[PDB]
Design brief:
5 chains; part of a larger assembly; mainly alpha; 17 helices; 358 residues; two-stranded antiparallel sheet
Chain lengths: 358, 358, 358, 358, 358
């Protein structure tokens, strides 16, 4: 089956970076695999089909007179109703899996755009930021051994501030590339377009699916029988039934169940992407209180003004998911205690000797 | 078969931490695999089905006159009883495996919520706690070589208490991050919600399964025969049997055995999750006697007050399963001897020389 | 086939420890694989079954009149004997592999209990004991170089006993954790329960298998033919045979051979587990003579009193299988020469220079 | 096919030791694989069987009247000869592969006993012996540099014997563990039992195979036709042939060829195991002449007395196959020149400078 | 198919040594795979066989009257010719693949003997020789730095011969183990027997194949039709055709093509093994001119006398294929320039500085 190859290349399972949101991953998985699951269920295994169209041939017909009967109607699904001569065609019945696979291949386009048009630049930017930030750490670790003996023999404030103010006017304190780079990117407005188009494309795809199920479906839904004609051409000069009646389709139940499953999964899926859109309409300040005290993280919370549709918002949202990898997963995450000061000076007097790590 | 792929991703077999309880693992395994086992048994291998519906066609019928007979009834399971004209449908018979697979995919949702909404925060918290605790050990091992010569040449109490009281007023004795962190988490009430919802979701799922087996089942349970009609449409202008009688279904025994197996496994499974719920309604104090003497473990047993529904209870329950990994599996587990004192001073005089380990 | 998956997870092939006895392994292998082997042999490969029920339809019947004949009896195995109207049913014939697979899954429960309820504690205990014992060796190897020059230039007894008695009153001679730990475990009585239940569960399972083969089998054993009825319902208003006679089952030979194989394997298997039970009713003292001279092994043979049902007996039995891994496989195993003294002093004078190993 | 799994576990391909003799390996391979080869050849590939029983139904019979004819005789192979009423049964024809697979699984039992009841002790013994022997070498290599300058400047005998006699009364010359261990094992008589039982078991298995081919075979060997009866029960009240004649079996040629192949392979296999038995009835002294001059190997040839049924004989036989691994494959194997002395003193004067190796 | 398993174990793809000749590999490949290729081609894929025997039944015969006709002749291939009553049997037609697979398994016996009876000793010998030869190199490399400054400042002959003659009477020049080992093996005559038997066995196998194709084939080669008899037993009391005529076999073309392919491949294969035999009848001296100047290789060319059937010849032939692995692939192979001297002294004056390699 081609489904094996599709799963082999499509949906088959830098160097540590998380570039895609978990909710985006979930919605991608459901929207991509569900058409494939309906594909596998409808035609294979469960319902051994054989001939999806079944007919009532007259008794006088031989073997492949009736074989022509049965084989000339599946490709010519047309209801010659007596009500003039409106041949109602039954193309949705033979087009169900075709539309399913077309929808499945259509669902993956936003992934293509998000993975080709935005991944390389974002990955390069995050590679630069991780390089500068681990350099920021190893240029700051050198302060924990300068503060193991001089930090002890002095009366608290005039060594917790005298060296801190000396470090304040010292190069290691500031991170100039950080503010300049963050400015040069926050003024940019290119990455938000990819996000908005990647969401709107799947939204309009869902709308098109709704229209497809509303127009071409919902009309032949309780009809399981139709009358065809064999002398719709040169057969007229023959002595047999003038109208081949009751071509019964066998997969009406599968038709109904796949239609209801498709409509239900998309009804339950729609609100999630709307929530994803609304995630970008506000500035996140859940933990802004602790970010304003740290030297490097002060700049992140400082540039919180104006309309929130900026590349800085997207960068921050993707950084919060990567703020706990192996090294940023530190006192930062441990700092759940200052969400409720001269006492903290002697508390961090001991903590600086506690963050020795290796 | 898709079952192979499902087992390949679903149920297929930080860095040492145990995040899931063994009883939870057992109930998950039984509730997830049992629908799959019934799926594999019912349709494949054991009972080579062929055509699950069998009919009695008249003798005059040719090959695929009777093939239409047999193929137009499986999808149109309707009993045209003579008792007006109540067409009793037989959709449970063709919906058994569909409902089975839907129930199988439904059973895994609580696992999804418990693994996405609570695992990262709990794992980070336990990573912090293990880091601080192995630091607590390697800042306490330094006491076993200070007590190899000064510990020997003195008259017992005034070196077993003089140094101990000096160590009592010494920094290594206390663990400030422990009480502050434990307070900041015991006042929190977020993790218990995930536990209660993860249990209640499977409970209501079991209730829904009971309702499904009570309404749609238990009605067609001893009926193996029904009469259908072929001229339920345009067939009426034909000379054959007016009513196609005795469409016999072949899988009634499989129907009954799968229904009884499903109801029995859930009856035997229900009390376990109730026990899991009741596990959180009480404070565990089985070994609180030995916890009150140890320095760090005194705080764990000290905060035992009020209503037991707190995140501290869940943290303690998950810690007791992880209290014997490689290092906490020590004198702690060895201390099964003080569950039945100046003599113990000379007993631990020798024990401190016995816990040299490397 | 599901048998492939079962073999893939069930029965498919710390860090060196042997936790399961070889005889237990053999009985587990035979009791678990034999139902699977009968499963594979009975239904697949050997006997291409097709239709396990065969019937004699009247000559006037068409194709699927007789197909209904053949398909409506396998699921309705009932002998309408003329002797009133005792319908003898033939459910064992269609339930053979179901009971086989149920028995196969039932056989593995004692393994589950023995592997979950006792393995972790025993493994931790043995890990502690191996750590303390290799420490006991590397704190005793230091005696073979103190005895390379002082051991030579003295008149035998007053250096083979003067240093030995000095070593006797020396710390390295005794192993305090050994006697204290061995006491704290020999007074315990928890592990023997797991052993006794793991044996009794398979014993009662064998008894249940015997009852199943005695009641539901041994009755339809020479019967290969039975008469059914088609008008056991709405068929009565039809002109055909009033009683469908001679529904012949084809797998009677397979029935008999699988029944005899099952009963024979369990008759030959029963005494082994009884022997396993009797293994725990006595204290093993085959090599107690050599254990009483060694320092550490003297305590093992010293606590041989009272009723033998103790956790110490189980620990010793599992230790004798692990007493020859890589280091305990030493002079211990070499000491087959003292099972038939001042001469041995000069014999071990040379042996201490012979146990230099690296 | 289960043959794939059997080959996967059974017969599928310490740390250098050779524990099994090449002739034993050959006889094991032929006796184990040949039943499997006949299994694969008889039923699969070569002869596409279909229905191994073929019958002559009367012309009036319909499709599955004759299908019942053909399917009710394979399981009821009984010749109702007119000669009273001796129903000769044809169970060997349907039992050929069953007996083949039973014989195949039976052949592996001696391997099981030889691999479980004797391998661990023998492997431990050989591990000890290899450890002591490579120690014997590296305590003897130190003599080739003491003899590079003192060996040169002296008049031959009084340095080829003066140092040799000094080395003779020196500790490195003798190997006390060797004679004591060899005595403690040569007096033992446990390992020879495993060898004799492992041979006698396959011998009695071959005898049982001969009896099986003599009683149950050789009787139905030229009979390809037999007459059955359908009214051997409730069929009597029917109007058809009173006796269903000429049930012809199709696999008579395969029957004959497999019988002849089995008997021929075992006739050609019998003498080899008899030779293996006779190998232990004599003391091997082919190269005893060179063993009596070497220091360590003198003890091996010294204990050659009495009846040869001892564990020492088995140990020596397994050692001769391992005497050429990497280090014992040395001058020992090179010493093919002393099988046809003061000249050899100056020949070995140069050879000791030739065995410098690294 | 069993062919997959056979290819999986048989013919499926120390530590660098080449133990088998390329021509031997080619002849083994062709003689082993060609029967398997004919096996795969004759019965599978290409010619969908169905029933290899086809018969002309009379028109009055029903379905399985003629099925008995067709099924009772394939196993009873006998031509009841009118010419008394010589039943000519047609067993080659049903024995073609049996003889093919027997020949295929027979072809591998010489490989078995050559791989079990000679590989271990030869591999050990070559391991010893490679160890001594790379030692011979690293005890000779030390001459290229003693000759970097003393080699420069002297008038050519009295430093190209004065040091060379000093090295001539120096230990590093000679290789005593080489001449002694080469003598101890060249006097041996055991390995040539394995070679001669491994060739003669396949030769007599080819002769037996020729006899088989000459006697049992070439007689039924143009006969595609034969007449059988059904009343060759108890059928005589029936009213049908007294002689069942024209049992036509369908695979005559496959018979002819496989026979011609087998005979042709063996005719083209015969001379190669004869050439292999003649390879051992002469002493190879193609490059003996360059071997007589090298120190170690002089002994190899020195022992070229007498009849060439010796183990030394086989050792040399297998060494020439291994003389270019990684280190013997050196100036040796580069020395293609002395096959057409004081000038060479200054040429090798520069070459010794050119063979510095690492």
């Amino acid at each position: 089956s081609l489904a094996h190859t599709a799963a082999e290349y499509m949906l088959s399972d830098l160097k540590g970076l998380r570039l895609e949101l978990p909710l985006d991953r979930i919605v991608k998985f459901v929207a991509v695999g569900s058409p494939l699951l309906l594909m596998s269920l409808a035609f294979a295994q469960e319902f051994s089909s054989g001939s999806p169209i079944s007919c009532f041939s007259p008794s006088n017909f031989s073997i492949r007179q009736a074989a022509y009967v049965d084989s000339s109607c599946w490709d010519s699904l047309l209801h010659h109703k007596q009500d003039q001569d409106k041949m109602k065609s039954l193309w949705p019945h033979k087009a169900l899996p075709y539309s399913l696979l077309a929808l499945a291949l259509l669902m993956y386009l936003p992934v293509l755009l998000w993975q080709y048009a935005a991944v390389p630049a974002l990955s390069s930017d995050l590679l630069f930021i991780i390089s500068e930030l681990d350099k920021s750490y190893n240029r700051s670790i050198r302060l924990v051994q300068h503060m193991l003996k001089i930090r002890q023999k002095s009366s608290d404030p005039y060594v917790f501030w005298n060296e801190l103010e000396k470090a304040r006017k010292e190069r290691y304190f500031e991170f100039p590339l950080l503010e300049r780079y963050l400015a040069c990117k926050q003024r940019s407005h290119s990455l938000v377009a990819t996000y908005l188009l990647r969401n709107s494309l799947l939204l309009i795809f869902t709308s098109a699916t709704y229209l497809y199920l509303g127009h071409f479906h919902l009309d032949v839904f309780f009809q399981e029988e139709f009358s065809c004609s064999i002398k719709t051409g040169l057969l007229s000069d023959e002595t047999h039934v003038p109208n081949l009646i009751t071509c019964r389709l066998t997969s009406l139940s599968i038709f109904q169940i796949v239609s209801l499953s498709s409509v239900a999964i998309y009804t339950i899926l729609v609100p999630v992407i709307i929530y994803n859109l609304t995630r970008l309409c506000r500035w996140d300040k859940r933990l802004l209180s602790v970010y304003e005290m740290l030297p490097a993280f002060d700049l992140l919370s400082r540039k919180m003004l104006g309309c929130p549709i900026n590349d800085l918002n997207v960068i921050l949202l993707f950084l919060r998911a990567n703020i706990s990898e192996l090294i940023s997963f530190s006192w930062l995450s441990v700092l759940c205690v200052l969400k409720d000061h001269n006492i903290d000076t002697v508390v961090d007097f001991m903590t600086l000797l506690a963050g020795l790590e290796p």
